[PDB]
Design a protein around this ligand. Structure first.
Ligand SMILES: COc1cccnc1CN1CCC[C@H](C(N)=O)C1
Ligand SMILES: [Zn+2]
Length: 139
């Protein structure tokens, strides 16, 4: 679990979005595993606008943060789960690191701000849904 809170927006994994997220929907994209909903309170986070390929992510199944080197956002095949059919997920960045399904929502940060959220993984890999291209999150 986990979310990004920026301005009057809440960014979550689309497959973990709640009934309240869908009732206050701003934008969603199944191919990215992202959903953004509106909030009444001002958020705590800020978004990176950069090309960093290193950063630190929070891993809830270890209660720890780990440093990672990750690939640039790209189209990556993701196997079927109870949430999606087997498909290509876009804007995904892969790294070597521990992750389990419940780790989705953990934030990846670089020195500039939030980069994305945990969305995929297994077998010593962890994948992050990028949010740096969503410029409207800041307006
Ligand atoms: C950290 O995520 C892990 C780890 C291990 C195994 N499965 C996942 C996530 N997995 C299941 C939920 C939907 C997700 C997706 N974006 O399609 C894929
Ligand atoms: Zn950066």
């Amino acid at each position: 679990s986990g979310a990004i809170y920026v301005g009057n927006y809440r960014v979550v994994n689309r497959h973990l979005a709640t009934h309240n997220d869908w009732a206050n929907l701003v934008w969603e994209d199944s191919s990215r595993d992202l959903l953004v909903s509106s909030t009444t309170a001002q958020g705590c986070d800020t978004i990176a606008r950069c090309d960093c390929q290193t950063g630190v992510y929070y891993c809830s199944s270890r209660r720890k943060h780990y440093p990672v080197s990750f690939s640039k956002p790209s189209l990556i095949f993701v196997e079927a789960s109870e949430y999606y059919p087997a498909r290509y997920q876009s804007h995904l960045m892969l790294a070597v690191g521990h992750s389990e399904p419940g780790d989705c929502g953990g934030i990846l940060r670089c020195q500039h701000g939030v980069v994305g959220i945990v969305s995929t993984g297994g077998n010593g890999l962890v994948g992050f849904a990028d949010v740096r291209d969503l410029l409207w999150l800041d307006e």
